[PDB]
Design a protein around this ligand. Structure first.
Ligand SMILES: Nc1ncnc2c1ncn2[C@@H]1O[C@H](COP(=O)(O)OP(=O)(O)OP(=O)(O)O)[C@@H](O)[C@H]1O
Ligand SMILES: Nc1ncnc2c1ncn2[C@@H]1O[C@H](COP(=O)(O)OP(=O)(O)O)[C@@H](O)[C@H]1O
Ligand SMILES: [Mg+2]
Ligand SMILES: [Mg+2]
Lengths: 175, 471, 500, 469, 144, 71, 118
């Protein structure tokens, strides 16, 4: 139930970021806030503590997040007043997921046994960006050597496995 | 200088939010006095009591009057105490509201009068008194088969339209005049009509100036119908604590206490218990019901009418109050439909005081022999229903022949039922109904017709009515 | 654990202006619609129980004023209300337009004309939920409510100001007893109100036409909530009827209000509570299903002389199932009212109409309401029926002793033939007195069973041209005339009557 | 634009999200039409009825067919109106489903035909009929003992094997013969083989060229079966309003309507009320049966089979229907095995109409005397069993000799049974059947044999069947 | 859900320890109040399925004169026989036999045929057993 | 009789969906022979087990229960 | 562990011969089937259980396993001392999780007695 409530907040912040026309200053700041809240987990236990009054928690956010953008600060101060500060990293991650649909960029993860050169990465990125419909495509490589001399590509929830799947389909079709 | 907003208004139930560290307590009274700034607002004079704490400085309350008009963001004045009720001999001869304020149009109680809070812990174990003495009522079923205890709690279990308001008014007519101590009638959730008839009967019969009256009748929202029994109770607790006075306390429909708790409990955030009742059905009627006790200072003899819904004695609100009462009289719809008034089930009615060291050995064995013949006839009911009377083996015919006479002679004409039928009513001492039931069980009155025993005070009037019938 | 106000564009317009101060509005937009129950963000200056107006024009009542949304109950057809419609607040707490100009019209529970004769020009409104008259505001019931039905006016009499349940199965004549006791109020100073709750619109149309035929719409007001109308209008029909009667009650007039099938209101309130997801109790009715009818029927009082002397007598109807008087809603409404009239089903099938079970029909407060002649005449009527019914229950066949053979059975058969009536023909009280006198004193022991109805029909025409002194005596002095002259009049008719 | 997108699918319940401000109103129809673009997907044609609004611009619907294949994210088209059903002359003789589509193989209705909405408010208080008129069926045992009302609800308690469908076909034939009235059948949740049997019997009867049928049968989802009586009724309302004529409307087993709404409400997530019924039991039954009224222009009268679950009349599903019934016609098996057609039980069939104000004085006295003589003859059965036929009295022997003539006279020759017994059948007016039962009760036709009274139309032609024997 | 576990967790604690543990025991007597005598309710059928037998007390026997109100036909002991002393066992056997015989033969004696002497002796025996098994209030009797 | 019959088994140790899908597999194996022109006889031994397994599936998927918790 | 499959079961019904004449005549036991004892106390249920264990381990060589699932620790101890006295205990294996234990133990006691018999 938590992810759809994060999605509501992220879609509201996405609509106000698309309406205000300050999209990059919102996006990089929410990325920095998500990194800072993934760095330390004791800040949620600090803001869940009952003897601190709501004005002290609001001043604590306004002091600790003094450099953030104004719609992001208003969003987090609404999240504090709703007892929803335990829901902020998921909505930050879903906000960065939804802003890349506006940019058109998709994030792909490629499991390769050998580290691939950048020219083939750019070629497959342009090819599957023309296939999937993206303007450009971001490729994240891994150094897992379990693949049999190949690369398997993950485009969201639809994967392109061609490394050990040949031998797997061979021993499946043999029996 | 700490006040609180209104957050939620949900029918009878209001959420109030204070500053941090200034929540009142549970059970404190909260006041709202709003002044209707424009034409889109309503003047409000409303009192709230606290039921819960919810966290985030909020308070879950229960209102005492109608909340139609409350706006979100309206300010609430805390009082710092529970609902304080004016108490003393100021209350004698007056009619009161749930909030202690007088409703009888004779004036208002001054602000410097003594006021006791509604809510207090029950009397302890070392303070109680357990002497059992019989209260003579003049009702033949009550005097023979379930005697009332002078200083103990008493129940009047019935359905709807079966005879327990008539029984409570005749117990007042037979007890409350000659009592010599303070009465309190706290009517909880019954007809506002019956609060008027009873008050004018107290006026013209001269009983009042010893009776305090508290009415929270069935027009009231359920927050009032809960705390009405407790404000009548604190009025009686002043007398038995401070003055050592013997107190009568008549409560009409103490069922409506638990029903008014059930109406608020869904909105208080509680889960429903079996049969739709609140979870705290057994302890809300244990915090009320353990304050009506006879302590070492004074004694409260309390008679309580208890409604039984859908004529279902297994319902959790009448079933969890049998364990609080010393004497019960279980009225039955069938006995009222046969014309037997009072419609007291002689077998489902029990008492602590029917024991030979208290009631006497002759009384005890006549009562047990009466119950024995009525139980044998109750076992014969099915054979009489299907096969008829003609199969019974000449002792069962005699048991039926005596039990018709017994269950008709338990019926009695009342002084209150003179307006119903014109028959003037009777008062029967205990030794005379023992003598009459012993003479019925001996077989001395087998030759009379069985319709000669209906609605008759004592057994010489059975003989007179049978002569008037023409036997 | 989703909250209903968590709406994406709504959260967007909340972080529009969070720390910058925003002036709060008196309009709100709907979040959820369904089953005649809505919710609306906005409306923070709304108050509990206020009429709110949708953009469609349908009224609504704000029940629950929660922290960021307002639980609204839609009073009307809700299929034109969408999420995103704006709700406007009126500023009034559940008012119906009530006036003298509402007499003879057929209205819905919001006071809008349904018969289509044009608008209703009233200048004054009365709230639907209002406190009952207190303990010092009342007075003991002492004035007769004449129904014109002989079994009610003799056995279970109604006083002006009491609440008497009329209970029975389906097709047992509750509505006919209502329309008879409304048609009889033409000579009196009674303002009738007929509240039809959950009935067929065809039968309400024929009810209104038989009221218009007998001239009954010069004083009656029909408040109609159909079976097709949603449960929020079914729930508010008795409260609208009471709020329309209180205007005339607190001005000193005397009002009769009839609730056709409050079991329909209880079923619609069970609906309206279970769609709010309130946990149900016995027979799935909510916890405050008693308080539903007690807030209604305790508001029907006989006021004192210090408050003008008006009166609201209420005749609520409860429909049982297979003659069950010990169900949950019948025993809830029995313990609110001052009596019951038990219309029994097999007495209605056998032909006895009105089919009053006189054993189970009680009038508590009545008896101080009879007219001092009906007392003398009917106190020896009631036990004849009682004895006759519980001895014809077993003594079907076989010879009996001469008292219980004839003086019980034949007298009871004459009582049953006396008390039968044909519908929409109310008898005045003096002719009831004289017929039940001629019965109980023994002047119907000679006449056979099959001729009692024609004896009564011709005896009324005999009285209307000869016994004007008897009828004027029972009008003015309210007591029986001197029995020599009255026995002379009945024997003078028995000399004329041709037995068949 | 009103294009939607599916979010949730769980059984019949489908949640669909539109854009803001472009929401569909409640009870609208939503066309889902999907051509499968690859081998993974499945072709879908599926209609949804809007039932709730959930917030977050979404809408909870109930489905009219199976939801297998619905993908999260696929396109939903808003119709802008509730389920539009064809009405007019083009519906006569045609078998239809709840969506107004022809089940038959005869053809399709063109798109330019008139289609009127499925959900309509009941006709107002201004527009109804003030008086109560009688509905003249031409059956004697109906028009004498349980008379019908224009704008009435009548209950059939027969079951199988007693000739319920024969009464249905003859009421269609008689009303469309004498009153010019179209009939509409609506089988709410009935066996499909019995629906086909009923269609072939009404095709063989020839009655169909005048009726219209709607079958949403048992295989369909509960959202279909809750709305089938409404689309029979919308077909009847065209001939009530636009044509202005006395229309029949047969709802077979309306208990299937009540429990179809019950299981719709259980799917929607509502708290169940007494006896497992949907909280909205009485108001859904009211929104059905308050459109069955007689207005100023025409009428719709309705004959409704009722299930009577665990055979008690105090269960809420019989109890909220019996508060709308104006008549009952009990069909008994021992009268069909005796040889009396129709098998209408003369003592259990009751009517609210049977009263001297509505019907008349002479009809009422003759009908009550018929019920008295048949009640006395039903009492005398054990006396004839244990004492024999003789030595009863003169009076009760005359009662038996009168009441068996009355009992066999209640049977008619139907126009339906002409292809089975070859007898042409008859429409008997109500004045001639009152005169016939009056002349039997006087004893004028007492000397004739009792087998002349069987299967005969009126009283002028029992003399010829006594003459032939 | 854990209401059976609530009662069983305390009623299993009532034990007789062995001679290694000291030999001390703890016998228990829990009470369950029925509502109009339904043994088939929820809490009675949870507690009946834990305890080592039960003593049914009935109002039908309370008001017919049998105080204590034990329905000894339905009342079960699950130890029984290992509890009693030798002298109680020897005579409680035949007392249980003829009280069960009287409970069977009383069924055919409320109306009708006025049974012969061969079981009228057993009915008189059983009425004397019922009259022996009554007591007063707070008068306990030793075993002898 | 196994020259012409087909036995479809969802025994009690299998999970609730196979118990749910056994009768629909029955008609899906029978309708092939029905629309080829043959006559089929399908026997569903204890559909009450199938109803109880669908009750189990609807309750563990959090669907709102009706009477006797059947959905 | 999963149940045994379809082809692993026995195709014929065979009869588990007990040596008890009521059982052998009027209600025979399937070798591999499931039986119900409906008895309280005083009926010799423990003696019937013991002669079943004795006759099966005498004539068939079959081990028994008693798995007591949540029933009366007193009766479990009575049954264990009667196992010791009878001398047939050396044939059975006993598993007791009684009413005193939490419902996880009462859930899994039947299955651990079952995996001792398997
Ligand atoms: N005194 C009477 N004499 C003759 N007929 C009567 C009498 N009273 C009522 N009826 C008839 O009984 C029929 C049913 O009565 P009525 O409809 O008033 O009862 P009801 O309880 O309102 O029925 P429902 O609840 O089904 O509407 C009416 O058609 C009416 O004509
Ligand atoms: N002793 C009595 N004699 C005659 N009638 C009685 C007697 N007691 C009760 N009744 C009748 O029974 C009814 C009981 O009503 P009441 O006790 O006032 O209501 P409730 O039981 O709901 O409080 C009254 O209407 C009265 O007519
Ligand atoms: Mg009362
Ligand atoms: Mg009615």
């Amino acid at each position: 139930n938590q992810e759809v409530i994060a999605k509501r907040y992220a879609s509201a912040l996405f609509q106000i970021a698309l309406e205000q026309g300050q999209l990059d200053r919102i996006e990089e700041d929410v990325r920095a806030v998500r990194q800072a809240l993934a760095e330390n987990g004791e800040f949620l236990s600090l803001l869940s503590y009952p003897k601190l009054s709501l004005d002290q928690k609001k001043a604590l956010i306004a002091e600790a997040f003094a450099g953030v953008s104004t719609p992001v600060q208003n969003t987090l101060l609404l999240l504090l007043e709703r007892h929803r500060f335990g829901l902020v990293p998921e909505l930050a991650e879903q906000f960065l997921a939804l802003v890349d649909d506006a940019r058109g960029i998709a994030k792909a993860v490629a499991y390769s046994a050998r580290p691939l050169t950048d020219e083939e990465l750019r070629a497959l990125s342009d090819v599957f960006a023309q296939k999937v419909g993206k303007q450009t495509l971001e490729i994240e490589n891994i150094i897992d050597p379990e693949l049999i001399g190949g690369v398997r590509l993950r485009i969201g929830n639809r994967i392109y496995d061609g490394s050990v799947s040949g031998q797997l389909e061979r021993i499946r079709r043999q029996l | 200088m700490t006040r609180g907003r209104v957050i939620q208004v949900m029918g009878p139930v209001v959420d109030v939010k204070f500053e941090n560290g200034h929540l009142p307590a549970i059970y404190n009274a909260l006041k709202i006095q709003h002044k209707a700034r424009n034409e889109n607002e309503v003047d409000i004079d409303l009192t709230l009591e606290v039921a819960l704490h919810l966290g985030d400085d909020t308070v879950r309350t229960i209102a005492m009057a109608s909340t139609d008009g409350l706006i979100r963001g309206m300010e609430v004045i805390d009082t710092g105490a529970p609902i304080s009720v004016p108490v003393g001999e100021v209350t004698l001869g007056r009619v009161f509201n749930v909030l202690g304020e007088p409703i009888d149009l004779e004036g208002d109680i001054p602000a410097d009068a003594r006021r006791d809070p509604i809510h207090r812990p029950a009397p302890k174990f070392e303070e109680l008194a357990t002497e059992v003495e019989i209260l003579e009522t003049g009702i033949k079923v009550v005097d023979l088969l379930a005697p009332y205890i002078k200083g103990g709690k008493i129940g009047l279990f019935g359905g709807a339209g079966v005879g327990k308001t008539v029984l409570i008014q005749e117990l007042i007519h037979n007890i409350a005049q000659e009592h010599g101590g303070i009465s309190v009638f706290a009517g909880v959730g019954e007809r506002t009509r019956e609060g008027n008839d009873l008050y004018h009967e107290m006026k013209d019969s001269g009983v009042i100036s010893k009776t305090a009256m508290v009415f929270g009748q069935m027009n009231e929202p359920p927050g009032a119908r809960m705390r009405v029994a407790l404000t009548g109770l604190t009025m009686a607790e002043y007398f038995r604590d401070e003055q050592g006075q013997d107190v009568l306390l008549f409560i009409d429909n103490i069922f409506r206490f638990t029903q008014a708790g059930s109406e608020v409990s869904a909105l208080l955030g509680r889960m429903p218990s079996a049969v739709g009742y609140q979870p705290t059905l057994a302890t809300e009627m244990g915090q009320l019901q353990e304050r009506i006790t006879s302590t070492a200072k004074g004694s409260i003899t309390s008679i309580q009418a208890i409604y039984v819904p859908a004529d279902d004695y297994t319902d959790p609100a009448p079933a969890t109050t049998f364990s609080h009462l010393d004497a019960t009289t279980n009225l039955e719809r069938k006995l009222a439909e046969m014309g037997i008034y009072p419609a007291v089930d002689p077998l489902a009615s029990t008492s602590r005081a029917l024991a030979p060291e208290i009631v006497g050995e002759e009384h005890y064995q006549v009562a047990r022999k009466v119950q024995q013949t009525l139980q044998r006839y109750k076992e014969l009911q099915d054979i009489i229903a299907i096969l008829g009377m003609d199969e019974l083996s000449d002792e069962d015919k005699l048991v039926v022949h005596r039990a018709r006479r017994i269950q008709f002679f338990l019926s009695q004409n009342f002084h209150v039922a003179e307006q119903f039928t014109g028959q003037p009513g009777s008062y029967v001492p205990v030794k005379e109904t023992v003598r009459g039931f012993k003479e019925i069980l001996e077989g001395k009155y087998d030759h009379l017709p069985e319709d000669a025993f209906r609605l008759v005070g004592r057994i010489e009037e059975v003989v007179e009515k049978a002569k008037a019938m023409g036997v | 654990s989703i909250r209903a106000e968590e709406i994406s564009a709504l959260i967007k317009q909340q972080i529009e202006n969070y720390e910058s101060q925003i002036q709060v509005s008196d309009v709100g937009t709907v979040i959820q619609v369904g089953d005649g129950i809505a919710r609306a963000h906005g409306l923070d200056n709304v108050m509990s129980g206020e009429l709110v107006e949708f953009a469609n024009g349908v009224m609504g009542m704000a029940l629950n004023l929660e922290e960021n949304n307002v639980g609204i109950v839609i009073l009307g057809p809700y299929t034109g209300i969408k999420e995103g419609d704006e709700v406007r607040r009126t500023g009034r707490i559940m008012e119906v337009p009530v006036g003298e100009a509402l007499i003879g019209r057929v209205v819905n529970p919001l006071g809008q004309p349904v018969d289509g004769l044009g608008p209703v020009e009233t200048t004054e409104t009365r709230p639907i939920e209002s406190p009952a008259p207190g303990v010092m505001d009342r007075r003991s019931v002492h004035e007769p409510l004449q129904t014109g039905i002989k079994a009610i006016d003799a056995l279970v009499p109604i006083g002006r100001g009491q609440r008497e349940l009329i209970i029975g199965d389906r097709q047992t004549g509750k509505t006919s007893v209502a329309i008879d006791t409304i048609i009889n109020q033409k000579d009196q100073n009674m303002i009738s109100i007929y509240v039809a709750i959950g009935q067929k619109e065809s039968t309400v149309r024929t009810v209104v036409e038989t009221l218009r035929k007998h001239g009954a719409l010069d004083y009656t007001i029909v408040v109609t909530a159909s079976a097709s109308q949603p449960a929020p209008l079914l729930f508010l029909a008795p409260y609208a009827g009471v709020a329309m009667g209180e205007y005339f009650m607190y001005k000193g007039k005397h009002v009769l209000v009839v609730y056709d099938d409050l079991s329909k209101q209880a079923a619609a309130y069970r609906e309206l509570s279970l769609l709010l997801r309130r946990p149900p109790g016995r027979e799935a009715y909510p916890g405050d299903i008693f308080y539903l009818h007690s807030r209604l029927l305790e508001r029907a009082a006989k006021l004192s002389d210090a408050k003008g002397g008006g009166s609201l007598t209420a005749l609520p109807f409860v429909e049982t199932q297979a003659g069950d008087i010990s169900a949950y809603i019948p025993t809830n409404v029995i313990s609110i009212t001052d009596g019951q009239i038990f219309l029994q089903s097999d007495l209605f099938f056998s032909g006895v109409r009105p089919a009053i079970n006189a054993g189970l029909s009680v009038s508590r407060v009545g008896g101080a309401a009879q007219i001092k002649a009906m007392k003398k005449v009917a106190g020896t009527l009631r036990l004849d029926l009682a004895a006759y019914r519980e001895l014809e229950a077993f003594a079907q066949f076989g010879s009996d002793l001469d008292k219980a053979t004839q003086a019980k059975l034949a007298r009871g058969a004459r009582t049953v033939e006396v008390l039968k009536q044909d519908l929409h023909q109310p008898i005045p009280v003096e002719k009831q007195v004289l017929i039940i006198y001629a019965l109980t004193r023994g002047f119907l022991d000679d006449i056979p069973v099959e001729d009692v109805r024609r004896f009564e029909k011709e005896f009324y025409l005999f009285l209307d041209q000869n016994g004007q002194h008897l009828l004027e005596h029972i009008r003015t002095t309210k007591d029986l005339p001197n029995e020599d002259d009255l026995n002379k009049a009945i024997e003078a008719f028995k000399k004329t009557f041709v037995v068949s």
